[model samples]
Target chain A: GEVPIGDPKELNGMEIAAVYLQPIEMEPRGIDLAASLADIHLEADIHALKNNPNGFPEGFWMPYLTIAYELKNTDTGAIKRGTLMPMVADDGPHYGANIAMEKDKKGGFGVGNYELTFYISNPEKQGFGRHVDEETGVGKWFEPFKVDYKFKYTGTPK
Target chain B: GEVPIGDPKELNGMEIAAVYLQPIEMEPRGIDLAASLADIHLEADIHALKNNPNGFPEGFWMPYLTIAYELKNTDTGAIKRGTLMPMVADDGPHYGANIAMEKDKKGGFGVGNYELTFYISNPEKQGFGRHVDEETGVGKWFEPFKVDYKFKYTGTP
Candidate 1:
């Protein structure tokens, strides 16, 4: 029983004069990345940018784009590394799309093709992943996995 | 004593793998660009550490930086730009700034001078307050308000 959230309305006594709005500095409407090689180099923080004078004249936000991966296995490749949260947008060039299923007129969303494995060396802060020794590469990165060459344009909205 | 966040993990016959693994882009971080000019763009995500035969000193993955700032006060002059959430960290330059002091320390973070007023030819979602026409400026954004700014910086993290 710990519920008490009151006392927010005072004028003359200086208790109900809550008006402290200060936060200004905006700009960062683009950044893209997709590893194993597709689209890289991204650092983002784009809150809002609307040209919408009416009916989405190019305006959308949510799923902000964040991907980190390492996963492999093509019948006998065996490996895993993970991190994937795709959702991007802007004036062009594929932004974490979603809408596939033979062009989903009714594929019922959510497709397939996923694997996992991620432990990129932090053996208590880097003991060099089992002491390197993959033919004198010294300290291998354990296993860098990622394989996906074809799965063109996926989208869904409406 | 209130703890119960259990029961939601049991997918027998395991077989759920989906990998689209690729797609991340950014470069256009601007918010409300009319009122008065709220420009802030800086995003950094550096994760890579491989060569730490032992603690500290080049053992890789020893970089930590996460900052977010997006302010748009497109309500100039008469000042009417609101809502701001900035908690920056570089340990230098207003590190973790949420200022509102106003009298002194202009460089040590303590600014409260905010104003936004943009007249894009009389048109704003067909709403209230804000209807300009200050002599040939012929417009409608009649009345809008906001003002506050205080900055500070102290380095070394």
Candidate 2:
């Protein structure tokens, strides 16, 4: 499936297209790209919560103690390793992802990013400690965040 | 009982001294500091087998994988709710000592700096991906670090 990038424009009577190519150079699978994008999205939302005012389900932010999923290779067929990367409970958009794929197996692969959202309680301490955003008028505290990512398997049976 | 520092002086004919006030940090227990040092020496020897040298025992330079441990407040001794720290492997030397203290309720208190040693392998990239140094012959890598603080029971036992 394709993720539309909204609004195709025209310049000088010739249509100018804006596009984000699928299957990035590092990862060559559409599913893998989507999974990574999902991971990115989750982290972005988390950042918004920290930087933005809104929080929780109503907002784009999502917090997780331990979140996980799967990925597979399309060319071959194989299942990769599962990973668990935790965050520092009271910190900024703490996000990352871990995926394990056995090398040259039956084409099953998984990869993505992770992130969190929270307010900056102390800007000065952000250097050594946590962050603080004075402009937002938010006091020192850490809130929950949301998670997001994509995953898929080869159409062929293993 | 003591690692000798040095003699007093060359010619102090009229030497007059008062009581030597010594602050005993903690009463000596059966905790084997030298034995631990010996183990570190042995491990360092094993690592020296390859071209890379320097085995820094109990330093924080290694990638940590941990299980059954969490981070909490230094005071109050209550579990800091909803907290997650970098879970360092509990099997390490310092971690093992930490666990032992928590498990054994002796009058003896674990004190002083909890030092750690670790290594970071060299980085190389092949056509496929970058390689980690443990598999290659780079330079000697030694990461020796110290954590100085105090740990005392805060809550009811």
Over B1-157, each residue of candidate 1 has an lDDT whose tens digit, in order, gives 1111112111111111111101111111232122112112111111112321111122111111122232222222222222221111111111011222121233221222322111111112211111011211112221332222222211111
- Candidate 2 recovers a fraction of native contacts equal to 0.00
Instruction: State every prediction's TM-score relative to the real structure.
Output: 0.20, 0.21
Q: Which residue segments of model 2 deviate by more than 4 Å?
A: A1-48, A51-65, A72-81, A86-102, A106-158, B1-157
What TM-score would you report for chain A in candidate 1? 0.18
Report the poorest 10 consecutive residues by lDDT, candidate 1 chain B.
B18-27
Total clashes in model 1, counting residue pairs 3 or more apart in sequence or in different chains: 73
lDDT of 1 at A124: 17
Q: What TM-score does prediction 1 earn?
A: 0.20
Off by over 4 Å in 1: A1-67, A80-87, A90-114, A117-158, B1-97, B106-157
CA RMSD of each candidate after superposition: 25.2, 19.4
In terms of TM-score, the best-performing candidate is: 2
